[PDB]
From a paper:
The CHAO structure can be divided into two domains: a cofactor-binding domain composed of two four-stranded β-sheets (one parallel, one mixed) and seven α-helices, and a substrate-binding domain consisting of a twisted seven-stranded mixed β-sheet and eight α-helices. An examination of the three dimensional atomic structure of CHAO reveals that the overall fold is substantially similar to that of the human MAO B monomer, with a RMSD of 1.1 Å for the coordinates of the α-carbon atoms.
As with the holoenzyme, the ternary complex crystallized with four molecules per asymmetric unit. An examination of an omit map in the area of the substrate binding pocket for CHAO crystallized in the presence of excess cyclohexanone shows an appropriately-shaped positive electron density feature large enough to accommodate a cyclohexanone molecule. The peak is relatively weak however, indicating that the occupancy of the active site by cyclohexanone is not 100%. In this position, the cyclohexanone molecule is sandwiched between the aromatic side chains of Y321, F368 and Y459. The side chain of F368 is positioned near the cyclohexanone molecule, with its aromatic ring coplanar with the six-membered ring of cyclohexanone.
Numbering used by the authors: 30 to 478
The structure:
Amino acid sequence: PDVDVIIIGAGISGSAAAKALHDQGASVLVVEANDRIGGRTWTEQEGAPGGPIDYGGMFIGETHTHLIELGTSLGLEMTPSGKPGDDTYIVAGNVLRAPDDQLDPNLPFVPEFLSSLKALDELADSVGWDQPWASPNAAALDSKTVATWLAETIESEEVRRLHTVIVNTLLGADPYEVSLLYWAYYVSECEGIQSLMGTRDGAQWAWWFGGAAQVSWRIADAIGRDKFLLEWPVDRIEHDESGVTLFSGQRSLRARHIVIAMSPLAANQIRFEPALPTSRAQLQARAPMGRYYKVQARYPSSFWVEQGYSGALLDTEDVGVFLLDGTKPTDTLATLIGFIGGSNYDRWAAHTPQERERAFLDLLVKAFGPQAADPSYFHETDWTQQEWAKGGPVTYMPPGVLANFGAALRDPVGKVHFAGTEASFQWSGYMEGGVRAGQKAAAAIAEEL
Ligand SMILES: Cc1cc2nc3c(=O)[nH]c(=O)nc-3n(C[C@H](O)[C@H](O)[C@H](O)COP(=O)(O)OP(=O)(O)OC[C@H]3O[C@@H](n4cnc5c(N)ncnc54)[C@H](O)[C@@H]3O)c2cc1C
């Protein structure tokens, strides 16, 4: 056995796992499929103009305790993501402003929207974060889509449309392909849509100067860059009572334990001898990744903030996106970032690169004025077609799975253990979760030695 533990996957999670295992004294190796240490945290510090740019995850939540601790211990510094000003909703094509995310109460759709929002949170409490599958209403919830739930519950077409962008954007899927139990679970495990949907707090409250991929790179540096083997895609995993043997084509390694720290979908692209037990097998084969676009437009000044707008925006139909200010104090170019997912992604991916850009810029203009009409820099990053991430921002599940194999997300199969954000108890789908899943996997393994 070449080493104690081999961590497959060099994301925040795999990396956090290796730091932990390493600090505890175990011999460790991190085997990574492509040629970069970031996870779905992808950073180019000198790449683009204006400042460092993140193509993946970048927001640190106010309660993302493990991420903050780890980042800090690595010497990284945080800066507030929030911006002062009114938030913006583009509903039915009309521009609405909301002082402290407080829409005019007289707007016809507002009260039922609030009401439905409270409904969602209540449903999120009926099923929990720890054992959604064991919840009393698990069977009924996991048997229908979020789409059918919106149709049966809500009156206002506009409320329905708000919920849909929200789901299309937090997951990279549309309510028409997501299990209701699964979403109730998600809202529950990320502390409610209120935090899930924050604009200046909750999940979206801070950034790392320098880029999110740093926590990873820094770990590698701290742990011994030589320990991270890039371009080493694991394709077969032979595991017995003694340990595990990884194969990358002809090459191979041997360890006492392994932690596969990637999405279920991603892990499902690896052969396991012996075959994985059937619940984990189903879980991996049936838990897809979202369909997502991360657009970025930089300008010489924060004209949106300068005009009293926070840059935070929600649009139900022009494009189908959540906008957010992404300007660091340090940057030399103001930047607005937008996220398009699910069916909204489907929509645009069908258009041409330029059509997309035009449409996006048009929107920015409708919301913030003609200055948006012409950016200093524009970038789009299609996650649904990234080779190793294979999609959206997070994992999602169709009706029929979470309630039948959910536990497979966490339970180890012999000597192989599972990390990756999807295995976190809470904040699964976020870097925080990634960090937590990694550390818990590490501890489990530590204890086995
Ligand atoms: C556009 C976008 C925006 C996001 N924004 C945020 C945000 O603001 N805040 C937040 O908290 N989260 C955000 N996220 C999610 C966050 O990035 C992820 O939750 C987190 O990075 C997942 O980490 P991970 O370590 O579990 O997995 P990953 O980051 O997916 O890393 C898994 C690693 O495994 C490697 N791998 C895959 N297959 C193999 C194989 N066969 N052999 C070897 N290695 C393999 C991969 O290449 C990769 O490096 C966002 C995601 C996207 C796509």
